[PDB]
Design a protein around this ligand. Structure first.
Ligand SMILES: [Ca+2]
Ligand SMILES: [Ca+2]
Ligand SMILES: [Ca+2]
Ligand SMILES: [Cl-]
Ligand code: NA
Ligand code: NA
Ligand code: NA
Ligand code: NA
Lengths: 473, 5
């Protein structure tokens, strides 16, 4: 009969289990026998206190490196301000030791945990690539709670080496099953930032994870976008509880906050899932998240039902992760078919945007060809356009099944005149739909100003398969 | 850039 952890702060880990049903349903996975044994997770951040009394028992030097100083030891740099505490806090959420009289527990409290010290220095493309590409046949899951500036005006993503690291990771990592990259969706809510303007979260190769407050609301720091896949609990207002984890200087904190806490919790749930089925591919894992995540009692004004009956929100993706459901569904999961890619060049001439532009195109999604897609995964609208004030633009994409994805909401602080240069806006909201039929792209000026520009390229890129659909929800 | 989160 499963015995829950006895750790002194475990009763404060409201998001792991509770009578109330506002939790990630992790105890149900633990009781099925899954606590992370044999799974290796690495935190890409400012280091990891490998001697922390709640991390040492699970620490894995093979999951760790110091890219900033080029040595094997990711110990954080200690300063009076304790600036380099972030990675240690993330690590404890994944894999803090259980039943040891110290602080609380990780989601995957028997997994092995490492850290890559890579933020405490100049974060070049090469630094990112050496981190994402660290020991890819040993590390299973990478967790990153960082990215481009959340000022609400930046459009930035992985440069060449980092993108190569993603492609190498998902292709050859983990024995050819693919490295699992978990990403926090961002803290730019106060700036009205969009997580589709962040190429790390907007990547198909990352599971981008947003946050919900204890009372089920969209936190102040949350960024809305169509690339987000799912949600875990994190912090909110000062009446709402926060995240309990390991802190720098061998301490315990009950006040870890922001989307930085959501990616590690997701990484821990994914670790339990991979223990339940070690043969899952990187795409299998995203399918499991889509099928098992739960909207219930997350509050948002944009919940919509997609073409296969699943509720989806730009604040939450498919909803809260459900660890018990993930490990249950993983056990007898049938590997998905190989990924197909259908490239559709939409325009026959440039189109002036003006106040409003609508582009309609009926597609066959590579009918008659080996890359025919009847079951969508990710879809991208790769757009090249000029505009005099980028943040006045709002962009929507409507699928043949009627699912309206917001690719870009207005960004009041984005005064850029640089437009978008083949930017691959991504949506998860049409997952499992048939992409044959009419797609609609809408570009609108949300301001009263007499703005101007031109759309010169629109590539619709469809990923997916042609077999295996479920009856719609 | 790259900011913590
Ligand atoms: Ca070092
Ligand atoms: Ca503990
Ligand atoms: Ca952002
Ligand atoms: Cl590709
Ligand atoms: Na492969
Ligand atoms: Na992503
Ligand atoms: Na259709
Ligand atoms: Na129509």
């Amino acid at each position: 009969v499963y015995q829950e952890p006895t750790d002194p702060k475990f009763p404060q880990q409201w998001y792991l289990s509770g009578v109330t049903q506002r939790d990630l349903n992790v105890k149900a996975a633990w009781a099925q026998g899954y606590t992370g044994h044999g799974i290796v997770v690495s935190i890409l951040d400012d280091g990891i206190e490998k001697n922390h009394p709640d991390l040492a028992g699970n620490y894995d030097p093979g999951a760790s490196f110091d890219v900033n100083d080029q040595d094997p030891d990711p110990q954080p740099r200690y300063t009076q301000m304790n600036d380099n505490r972030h990675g240690t806090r993330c690590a404890g959420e994944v894999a803090a030791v259980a039943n040891n009289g110290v602080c609380g527990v990780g989601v995957a409290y028997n997994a092995r945990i490492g850290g890559v010290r890579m933020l405490d220095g100049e974060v070049t493309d090469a630094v990112e690539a050496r981190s994402l590409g660290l020991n890819p046949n040993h590390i299973h899951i990478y967790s990153a709670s960082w990215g481009p500036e959340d000022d609400g005006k930046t459009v930035d993503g992985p440069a060449r080496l980092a993108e190569e690291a993603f492609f190498r990771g998902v292709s050859q990592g983990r024995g050819g099953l693919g490295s699992i990259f978990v990403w926090a969706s961002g803290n730019g809510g106060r700036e009205h930032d969009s997580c589709n303007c962040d190429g790390y979260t907007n990547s198909i190769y990352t599971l981008s994870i947003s946050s919900a407050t204890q009372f089920g609301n969209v936190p102040w720091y949350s960024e809305a976008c169509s690339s987000t896949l799912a949600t875990t609990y994190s912090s909110g207002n000062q009446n709402e509880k926060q995240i309990v984890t390991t802190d720098l200087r061998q301490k315990c904190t009950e006040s870890h906050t922001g989307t930085s806490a959501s990616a590690p919790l997701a990484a821990g749930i994914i670790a339990l899932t991979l223990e339940a089925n070690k043969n899952l591919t990187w795409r299998d894992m995203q399918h499991l998240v889509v099928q098992t995540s739960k909207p219930a009692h997350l509050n948002a004004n944009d919940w919509a039902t997609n073409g296969v009956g699943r509720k989806v929100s730009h604040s939450y993706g498919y909803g809260l992760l459900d660890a018990g459901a993930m490990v249950a569904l993983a056990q007898n999961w049938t590997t998905v078919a190989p990924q197909r890619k259908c490239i559709i060049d939409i325009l026959t001439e440039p189109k002036d945007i003006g106040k409003r532009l609508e582009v309609r195109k009926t597609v066959t999604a590579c009918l008659g060809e080996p890359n025919h897609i009847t079951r969508l995964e990710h879809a991208q609208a790769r757009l090249t356009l000029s505009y005099n004030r980028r943040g006045d633009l709002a962009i929507h994409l409507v699928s043949p099944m009627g699912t309206r994805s917001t690719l870009l909401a207005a960004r009041p602080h984005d005064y850029s005149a640089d437009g978008f240069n083949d930017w691959a806006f991504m949506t998860t909201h049409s997952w499992d739909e048939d992409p044959s039929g009419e797609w609609v792209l809408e570009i609108e000026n949300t301001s009263e100003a007499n703005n101007y520009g031109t759309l010169t390229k629109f590539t619709l890129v469809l990923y997916g398969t042609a077999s295996g659909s479920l009856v719609p929800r | 850039x790259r900011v913590k989160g």
